[PDB]
Design a protein around this ligand. Structure first.
Ligand SMILES: Cc1nc2c(c(-c3cc(F)c4c(c3C)CCCO4)c1[C@H](OC(C)(C)C)C(=O)O)CN(C[C@H]1C[C@H]1c1ccccc1)CC2
Ligand SMILES: Cc1nc2c(c(-c3cc(F)c4c(c3C)CCCO4)c1[C@H](OC(C)(C)C)C(=O)O)CN(C[C@H]1C[C@H]1c1ccccc1)CC2
Lengths: 142, 142
């Protein structure tokens, strides 16, 4: 169901990889800079996300990355269901748009990515932000 | 007020440092393994936390770590108020207790810490978990 569904995606910037988790119903995001797209990086990120938010189902833009036994262990341990198939381009475009706008304010790319995550989750779209929508969606399900 | 108050603390294990953020009203935690307690590590962690949860006020067990101009920049950029003074020993004892219980299941300490964060936030105390309490507290304030 809708409150526990997340989409994982990866995007490239400055010879680095940005791993993004999107809470599908709200548009709320978590993101991190990693050296390369690997099973180990995805597994560790999933384990972190699942301890912080209710993660019931995960989708990816890269099915081969979910085949990894390290990713399988993270989903098995956290009780996450892997679901095939999957917007993503637009989220990656909007995130890179925010990143480019703030890039000069920081030395490290990871700092600019976290500033971009902050801007995205706090942005009101009398409208609500993605941060307000995720908390609203999950509290309703409790 | 109560929904935006966080406590930061650091604890040592296996020659490494575990940086813990506790949502005071719920007992919900975020934690990471870092090489050493620095202004830069604390600043980056604060920037991440504030983009993910409403962080209005932060307290620490180590005031000298909040004096750093890098920590000051993170709080200024994210609009966090630093508040002097501050339970913590018991949270560190409970977290290390959970860590020791799972330590053998993983090679890396960081993996065991994330498993411990997952266990703590999901643990029901008909009672509610820290994960349910934080979402409940924040949705009420919306
Ligand atoms: C370094 C490492 N290598 C492997 C594995 C894990 C790993 C990954 C996880 F996501 C995880 C756990 C472990 C131990 C313990 C339970 C919580 O989740 C780790 C882990 O480090 C990461 C990648 C940085 C997180 C660590 O520190 O040990 C997991 N292995 C799975 C095959 C045993 C088989 C398996 C077991 C269960 C389900 C599916 C496959 C492959 C190698
Ligand atoms: C490497 C680095 N060194 C310094 C600083 C920041 C830094 C830290 C932040 F928390 C931060 C920002 C920056 C640029 C931009 C806005 C969002 O928050 C970074 C940052 O890397 C981290 C530590 C890994 C996050 C980066 O990549 O640039 C911040 N500097 C502050 C004195 C200018 C003065 C200041 C400015 C505003 C308020 C208070 C003090 C000292 C050196």
């Amino acid at each position: 169901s809708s409150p526990g569904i997340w989409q994982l995606d990866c995007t490239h910037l400055e010879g680095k990889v940005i791993l993004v988790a999107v809470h599908v119903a709200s548009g709320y995001i978590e993101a991190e800079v990693i050296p390369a797209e690997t099973g180990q990086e995805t597994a560790y990120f999933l384990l972190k996300l699942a301890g912080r938010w209710p993660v019931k189902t995960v989708h990816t833009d890269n099915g081969s990355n979910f085949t990894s036994t390290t990713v399988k262990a993270a989903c098995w341990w956290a009780g996450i269901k892997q679901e095939d198939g999957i917007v993503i381009e637009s989220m990656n475009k909007e995130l890179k748009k925010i990143i480019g706008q703030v890039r000069d304010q920081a030395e490290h790319l990871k700092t600019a990515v976290q500033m971009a995550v902050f801007i995205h989750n706090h942005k009101r779209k009398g409208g609500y932000s993605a941060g307000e929508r995720i908390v609203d969606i999950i509290a309703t399900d409790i």
